[PDB]
Amino acid sequence: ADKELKFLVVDDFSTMRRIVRNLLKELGFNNVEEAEDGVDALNKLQAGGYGFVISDWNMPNMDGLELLKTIRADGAMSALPVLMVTSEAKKENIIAAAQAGASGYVVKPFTAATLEEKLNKIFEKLGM
Ligand code: BEF
Ligand code: BEF
Ligand SMILES: [Mn+2]
Ligand SMILES: [Mn+2]
C-alpha cells in the first residue's frame, strides 16, 4: 500500500493508540493521527485527507460501532476502510460490526503479526 496513506487511530486509551501508531511506523506508515472517541474522530475525518481508520469500540461520546455506522452512511467517506480493534470478542459484537460494514475486526490483545496480517487483508480486498 501507499506509504503516505493517512491513518486515523481511535481509542479512548492512549496505550492502544500508542501501540497501533508504533506498529504502523514499523510497517512504514508515518502519516498517522489519533482521536479519543468517535466524535473527536469524525471531527478529524471531516478535516479531510484520511485513507484508513482503525478504531476501538468502547469509548465515551460515541462508541466505535456508531462511528463505523456514521462513516458508512456519509456519502463522502462511505467506503473509507474501517478496521475495528477492540476487547469485544463476543460473536454478536463481531456480527454487529461486520453487518455494519467493518473492513476487518481484530480482538485485543493482539500481536504485531495479527495487526499486520489483518491490515494487509484489507489492502488486498480493496486493491490498495
Ligand atoms: F475499548 Be475497546 F473496545 F477495546
Ligand atoms: F452500510 Be452497511 F454496510 F450496510
Ligand atoms: Mn490516556
Ligand atoms: Mn475503549
Side-chain angles (χ1 to χ4, degrees), residues 1-123 125-128:
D2 173 22
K3 294 300 172 294
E4 283 302 303
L5 183 59
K6 188 190 200 183
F7 282 76
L8 178 66
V9 174
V10 184
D11 199 289
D12 55 322
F13 290 96
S14 310
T15 285
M16 201 50 57
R17 299 199 302 268
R18 228 155 176 173
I19 293 175
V20 179
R21 165 163 53 79
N22 279 287
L23 287 166
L24 289 171
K25 184 185 157 186
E26 181 60 45
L27 293 181
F29 304 107
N30 296 285
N31 207 351
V32 181
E33 307 293 342
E34 299 172 32
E36 68 193 347
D37 63 37
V39 176
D40 199 36
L42 291 158
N43 282 335
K44 306 219 177 179
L45 285 176
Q46 267 157 337
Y50 291 92
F52 206 105
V53 179
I54 299 171
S55 169
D56 186 25
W57 187 321
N58 311 306
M59 298 179 297
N61 295 334
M62 186 197 279
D63 68 37
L65 174 53
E66 282 286 296
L67 169 64
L68 166 60
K69 281 172 178 176
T70 303
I71 288 174
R72 286 273 171 279
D74 181 318
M77 56 193 180
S78 67
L80 198 55
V82 173
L83 169 54
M84 307 303 293
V85 179
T86 170
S87 57
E88 297 298 336
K90 287 183 182 69
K91 298 303 182 182
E92 288 297 328
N93 280 77
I94 299 177
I95 291 152
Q99 290 296 136
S103 318
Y105 195 113
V106 165
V107 184
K108 306 177 179 168
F110 54 96
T111 66
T114 296
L115 185 62
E116 168 183 12
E117 287 163 23
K118 296 312 169 182
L119 277 173
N120 278 332
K121 186 167 177 63
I122 294 164
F123 291 154
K125 181 70 175 183
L126 297 181
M128 295 167 63

